Amino acid sequence: MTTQQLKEKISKIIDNFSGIRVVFTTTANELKLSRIEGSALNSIAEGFIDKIKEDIINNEDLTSPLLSNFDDRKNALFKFDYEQYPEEFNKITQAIAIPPNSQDYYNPLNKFTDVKGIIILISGDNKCLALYKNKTNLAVLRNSRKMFNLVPDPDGYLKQLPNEILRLDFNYDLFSIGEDFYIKNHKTLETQMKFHQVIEAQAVIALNSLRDSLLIEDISGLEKSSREISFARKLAKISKHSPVLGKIDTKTIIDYVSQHKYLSAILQINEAGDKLLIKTKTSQKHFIKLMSDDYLQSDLTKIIYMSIAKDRLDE
Amino acid sequence: MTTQQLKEKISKIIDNFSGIRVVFTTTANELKLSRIEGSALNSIAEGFIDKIKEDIINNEDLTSPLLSNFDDRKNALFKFDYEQYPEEFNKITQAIAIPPNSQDYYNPLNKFTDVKGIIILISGDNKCLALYKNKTNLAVLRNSRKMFNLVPDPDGYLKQLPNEILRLDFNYDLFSIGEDFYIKNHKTLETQMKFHQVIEAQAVIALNSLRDSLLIEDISGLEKSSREISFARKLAKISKHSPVLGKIDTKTIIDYVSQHKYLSAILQINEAGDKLLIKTKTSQKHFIKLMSDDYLQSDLTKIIYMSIAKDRLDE
Amino acid sequence: MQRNTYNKVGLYILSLAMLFVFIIILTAKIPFCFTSDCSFIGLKKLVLTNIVPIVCFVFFLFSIYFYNRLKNITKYNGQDSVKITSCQSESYESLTFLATYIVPFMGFSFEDMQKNIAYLLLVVVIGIIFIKTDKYYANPTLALFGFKLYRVNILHPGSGETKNLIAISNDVLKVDDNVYYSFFDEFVFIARKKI
Predict the structure, then answer these.
(1) Residues of chain C positioned with their CB less than 8 A from the CB of A157
(2) Is the same domain home to A120 and A177?
(3) Which chains border A (3 or more CB–CB pairs < 8 Å)?
(4) Using the beta-carbon criterion (under 8 Å), do B35 and C159 form an inter-chain contact?
(5) Domain check: are A214 and A264 in the same one?
(6) Taking the CB of residue A146, how many other CB atoms lie within 10 A of it?
(7) Where are the transmembrane segments (chain C)?
């Protein structure tokens, strides 16, 4: 889905604003609609409208690539590509169709520790915009603690209320429109809704194809360093979106490393020359950056550029 | 200062941990210190240590380019290199060297409406680290709806605490090490620290240089787009770190547009064959990215790529 | 007055707690009779024959309240560390203070109300001179509760080397040691070792 159609759909939701309901997500995976006060709900509504307007509506550098081509660019909303949906996405798609006459209602005597996620339903133009945010560990507030019961205090230690904070801000983690899911914070996706196993599965199928490529004598270094997600995400991108894997033969790759004036020095070639000699961590990182085609040049300046967050032009 | 030396200095501060101190700055430009409870301060120190570890210590994909070369990458701390320091940076530098026996303590009877930012002073191994924060609109949050004077209520209409609560979540906008300032959040620096006038003056210098380059047929479109801060970032980058504007002849540039697969169908050559017709917003963005050297092709896959986040390799 | 003046008044009232309990144990005249004929003489006669006992008792309660106010100082933020450069121990005060300003009040006769008014005026005069003479950290009630006083020269990791500060520590102090400061005033801070 193009970014312009995304902006048009969100704008058609935005100026045709109708209503907003807040429903929690539980540890036992049931909907529990809340009792937000009307002035407070309106304040959160206009704040969320301003935040989503600043993020999406008037933003000019917005890009929406697939999650499989994950990069480290800012102010972008990645599109979900995997058909395997974790259970929170099914919870979102249930929460966009909860009837208002239902009485499956929240009990606030549960110390607010049962809730593990806040859903913001921006409803309008007979459509729903479901914005989910994590619990974000009840980030610490600050009171102005008094003595006895006399409320002002010229000198007093400022402390924290224990668990009635419910810090939900105006930021969001990921939002869904229609049937396509969009994310903003990939860290809570990777660490909360059971995604790391999928990332290591893509990492080990990438490592299987890499050992089928016959390029490294020390593949044990990659499988001993690949349990971190900071390498496993790049391995998943190598597995699914790479113009090197299964596309370019080994001899052209070794000729490119032999002819390049940087990669011949930082990354050591094998003495036999049939394979590539990587052992160290920086050699691993430069190897990963090379095989994702992050080393580029122009025709004007003819300087070799290393790209952090590249983007295709032909598609 | 490279990224490895920055990681070494952050590690040297972190493992020889001495203690923290929270200093408030005000709208009337003076520095006050707060009265935080000991367990709350311990939790704040542990949370900031965990966030600072996840940002610099355990992070492998960390880059620190100059703020004059500000691209749109993530997981980066941009290095300040401009000549003129904003007044909040000098207030941070003053807040590093406040003597510990000072008695200009903050008065909490002001209802926290006078505090502009929060300075965290993490200290250790005879060096001072000065994180920065901004106070938002109370970090909108909830309560329990006390029925009369008793806390538990199953019918609790969820309301908001009044204007007395300060946000102190585990995030930082910028931090200070030694005599250099590194920047994480760019929006609060372009908004609160009065920096967008400096960016606009740099954009004025860039527009004067573009007019003197004698390339654009219609200058007034770029001047029309120049009031946007997101565009003014690109003119600041063009003024300070463009490798094509003024380095090479304009005939080579027009030959590059006349001999490309994508730029020949987007950017149009004039009738006299010496100027570029830049009218639409899409053509303005494509010309800006062309003059930013963001159109790069690989010598391996022969695929033209856009580069949102670039890095010069010979550095 | 107020602020710093009230802080020094609270420190002096906390210092005089040993005098208050000493007058309490010296002159009380409680009818400690072990026989059955010593009945209750009445509350009114007991509070008439005892005036300076109950006066010293509410002064002792004031001293306990001011000690609670001094203990409130270390309750908030004291999670910063410094390094001691010089640790010349000055703890002969609160013994010199006791043996000079409390032993004469034990050597003093408490019989007439005019004399007691004169001695209270002498207490007020000694306190007024003691307010602003930079020896106000002397405190025998502090020294009884394990606190050992020190004259230290801390060195902040990022600010500088501030000189001539008085530390009230729970345990012993030494050159090249790390303490945690909680400044009761500009001159006196409560220390706590980092180990």
Answers:
(1) 75-77
(2) yes
(3) B, C
(4) no
(5) yes
(6) 12
(7) 10-30, 46-66, 117-137
